[PDB]
């Protein structure tokens, strides 16, 4: 499918053809769902722990005698019914991360990108460069293209002057053509891209 081309505000050059094995492929839903959950659940640190009856720094003698006191029988000061005892079945440090087959990951990426093509949410630029890192001019650029909601900017490689002018409101977030993950894309509404970032995507995903 095709998307028109805009300069900086110079509007409507020609269009770009994209792959119908990447940008036309009738997206699944359950795959995308499980990809989002596996990506977001992998972010945890499992660092949390709780002491128990062998680690609670206490004593290891029965407090009492067994009989004569006329009393319920106790064997240690620190044990879970007492206050300040150990905890039975506390939370321990774990992993939480897991991986999927290689086919469904690429199926997920192709599905999401063909979806955002299908709703006219890719706005394609010829080129983007600044002489100096000015965040005001980048705001004027987004004012030129009439984008207001949450957005993505995708670059080629180290365009430092196109990266350093995007520490704006968190409407804007910055990806190269390498780190384009799933949760980077799905959380946004419209995505900006150059010409050559699209072709470097079409080299990697293939």
């Amino acid at each position: 499918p095709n998307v028109a081309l805009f300069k900086q505000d110079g509007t409507q050059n020609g269009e770009i053809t994209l792959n119908e094995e990447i940008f036309g492929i009738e997206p699944n839903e359950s795959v995308v769902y499980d990809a989002i959950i596996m990506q977001r659940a992998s972010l945890r640190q499992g660092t949390h722990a709780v002491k128990n009856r062998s680690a609670v720094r206490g004593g290891g003698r029965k407090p009492w005698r067994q009989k004569g006191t006329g009393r319920a029988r106790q064997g240690s000061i620190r044990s879970p019914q007492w206050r300040g005892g150990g905890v039975v079945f506390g939370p321990t440090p774990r992993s939480y991360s897991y991986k999927l087959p290689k086919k469904v990951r690429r199926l997920a990426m192709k599905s999401v990108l063909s979806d955002k093509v299908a709703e006219n949410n890719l706005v394609a630029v010829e080129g983007l460069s600044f002489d100096a890192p000015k965040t005001k001019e980048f705001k004027q650029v987004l004012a030129n293209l009439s984008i207001d909601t949450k957005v993505l900017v995708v670059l080629e490689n180290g365009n430092d002057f196109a990266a350093l002018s995007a520490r704006n409101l968190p409407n804007v977030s910055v990806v190269t053509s390498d780190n384009v993950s799933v949760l980077d894309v799905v959380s946004a509404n419209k995505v900006l891209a150059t010409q050559t970032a699209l072709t470097q995507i079409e080299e990697v995903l293939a």
Partner: protein, 146 residues
């Protein structure tokens, strides 16, 4: 599909049992285990395969056999796999394979004779069956034990 409207695949993520949490859930007061006895204690249950003091099944029947020290067994592919190599290739147990026909050839490829071939191939292998040579050369192909 987006973040605040997630939907799972239907019939594909169950809930749990939380056992010992109230009398009207169904599984409170002895937690699905019942009255006394050593299945209901802490970590009870006997080891696997135990009939009380009755002599179990593996002592009522005798030990039998041994294992060869030099068993050399092959990586059989029968005949119908060969029927997609249209005309003359040197079907060979080496670099040919490349498509999941043979992974981990065990001691060299053996060829069996089930069951029908209409090609004119030529075969390298390490062992054949007595109907395999007849079935291959009936179609006019050369075979060799190499």
């Amino acid at each position: 599909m987006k973040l605040h409207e997630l939907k799972p695949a239907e019939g594909s993520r169950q809930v749990r049992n939380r056992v010992g949490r109230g009398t009207s859930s169904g599984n409170g007061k002895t937690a699905g285990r019942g009255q006394k006895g050593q299945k209901a204690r802490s970590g009870g249950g006997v080891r696997l395969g135990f009939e009380g003091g009755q002599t179990p099944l593996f002592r009522r029947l005798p030990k039998r056999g041994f294992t060869n020290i030099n068993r050399k067994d092959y990586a059989v592919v029968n005949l119908d796999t060969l029927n997609r190599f249209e005309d003359g290739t040197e079907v060979t147990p080496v670099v040919l394979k490349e498509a999941g026909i043979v992974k981990n050839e065990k001691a060299g490829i053996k060829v069996l004779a089930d069951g029908e071939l209409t090609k004119k191939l030529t075969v390298k292998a390490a062992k054949f069956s007595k109907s395999a040579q007849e079935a291959i050369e009936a179609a006019g192909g050369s075979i060799e034990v190499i």
